[model samples]
Target: MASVERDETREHRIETEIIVDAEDKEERAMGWYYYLDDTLEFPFMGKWKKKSRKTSTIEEKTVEVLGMAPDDECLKDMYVEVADIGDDVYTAKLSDIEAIDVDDDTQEAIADWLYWLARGYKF
Candidate 1:
């Protein structure tokens, strides 16, 4: 299952929401993952926590390997990096679209999504 959302106020970015706040980051892990070509791969298994409202911390961000696709092409994981480019926004970039970085299917998937995003093709 999936959904589409858009706000013309900002372009070419992704967004996230805290479904539930918790003290233990592991317990708060959600069952959601990055979607590419209708297939599940990298999972977003963490949350944003502020130890001190006064102190600052860089938002969580990571990457991993997703093994191979049905086509046997090596693939890479995904992570939506929260960008503080003013106005509180996020950006999901396919910075790992190289032949050596991702499998064939994943490369194609990320390439497609990247194309759509570059062309302002809202999901």
Candidate 2:
């Protein structure tokens, strides 16, 4: 489980089971890698990293993964679009990601956005 907090308030928590191949634990960390490498515009651009920090109350907390778990357990594969962020809170729109062929420029743009996200933009 990973928790994301902003400014002192809890933002969201993500619990994921990284399906790892016994032969490649380090190589295959999470299922996102497949999406990053093959289907997405940029390879491994939006992947989340674990971060830890001390809170105002002197408690340690971590912030990672911009997307939250879906309210409907039936929805497993979906796309997340971050809408807003303020004072340690961020919002996202979860929708179904369609598979389609896009132009190179569009792909690059999406890739750039994902790269920006990987660099730690909350919203």
Candidate 3:
């Protein structure tokens, strides 16, 4: 359950659009998939804050957030294409990356995902 208060608007969208009428995990996953795809704007900068068990090292401070990862990979968690310091792009958890200098929509969208993860909710 969510302990901290969250944005009403974001919560509204999550309740109505992201997970509405979801009968299974796959549906919830796809719901989140398109929601992020439509909400986030690409080519923005994002920094990794959470320690990724997938990549323990803090490789980059600020990297270019390209876009979403492959559809198949996003069935469980949200992943985004991040171009690191060396211009090498790879998939990183959206929850681990914080957007920088982006529009309100992008920022809010990212924050929404981070909040969802913090709540320990699963698809």
Candidate 4:
């Protein structure tokens, strides 16, 4: 993986808000779930990546990002609820969706989680 630019400020936030006092993988994952749930505004537009792990097809789709997935699903990786334009909603990794014309706080919070993953840091 290519190196991600470090943001000490974001990192500190992650450490404190998403990692602090987590003793196991489940706890850590739950930390992330709650963090994103509180940070991201729901019902925002996002462009699906060319190939998401949920579906490797190349047809890029623009979906409505609804919210975070269940805590159980997030025990390993963060996932968000998404729906195809005027279609049924489903779960996809948060990283698979790129924020579209979102506010700065939303984008930065999403970026923090992605940066954590890209850095190869795990719970």
Candidate 5:
């Protein structure tokens, strides 16, 4: 008989670095890496914790990514960074599209929102 090892890990951690750019002002480009822990509850939408600037206030912001469609190109010109955490991606800009420092919460939220939007809110 062959012995098999069982994988009991229930969570996963992922890291991603973000970059930001403010169009109106000559804002200093910010760069930060976020560490996220993903569980079954929100597999694609993982729980995120900022590893840097522990005291800094981190709020959920909306960002809009330019889609391949010609109509989407117009959105690329009018970018705003504000939206509820649960807002869909197509209808909101969760963060500055050019931003470099994004928390894991924002990342997962945006990804989830976009995925749903792309699917026409089906699921």
Candidate 6:
């Protein structure tokens, strides 16, 4: 419900589900969250905030989990990387690796990628 007002009837209301901070910009590859439903556009460097909320029943699901890079913060409140539509090419958001150890031998990520039990995630 916040916006940047230039004048009367002239304002750009924030429309992002989550906002980012200026200090943490560079390290993040988590491309500002996006939705199969809504969209957003922000300035180069500025304090951003979250906006709006949708029902869980919303079919199309792709909550923009911005800032996904080699070693960045995990996507927030994400239980699984969604297709939101009908697609998949192994594009996942890497954040805090939550999966248990692949337990030696040879393990890998997506505590930063994707998984399905019997698998392990490293960071």
Best TM-score among the predictions, by candidate number: 4
User: What TM-score quantifies how close candidate 4 is to the native fold?
Assistant: 0.87
Off by over 4 Å in 6: 1-53, 57-87, 103-123
Clashes of each: 3, 1, 0, 0, 12, 12
Give the range where candidate 5 is weakest over 10 consecutive residues by summed lDDT. 28-37
Clashes of 4: 0
Check candidate 1 and list the clashing pairs.
73-103, 74-103, 75-103
Candidate 6, RMSD to the unseen true structure: 18.3
The TM-score that candidate 2 achieves is: 0.22
Show pairs that collide, candidate 3: none
Angstrom error of the Cα, residue 28, model 6: value is 7.9
Return the lDDT, model 5, position 3: 31
Badly placed stretches (over 4 Å) of model 1 are 1-37, 40-62, 65-100
lDDT of residue 70 for candidate 2: 37
lDDT of 5 at 41: 18
lDDT of 5 by residue, 17-62 (tens): 2213323212211111111112111212222222235767654333
lDDT by residue for model 4 over 67-100, one digit each (tens)? Answer: 8877666667888888887667777888888899
Overall local distance difference test of candidate 4? 0.83
What would the per-residue lDDT of candidate 6 be over residues 1-105, giving only the tens digit for each residue?
A: 223223221111111222233135431223233221122121011111222246434222333333222233343422223222234422232232222223221
Worst lDDT 10-window in candidate 3 = 50-59
Candidate 6, after superposition: displacement of residue 71 in Å? 11
Candidate 6 residue 66 Cα shift, in angstroms, is 18
Q: Which scores greater on lDDT, model 1 or model 6? A: 1
Instruction: Provide the TM-score for each candidate, comma-separated.
Output: 0.29, 0.22, 0.83, 0.87, 0.23, 0.17
Relative to the true structure, candidate 6 reaches a TM of: 0.17
Candidate No. with top lDDT: 4
Worst 10 residues of 4 by lDDT: 50-59
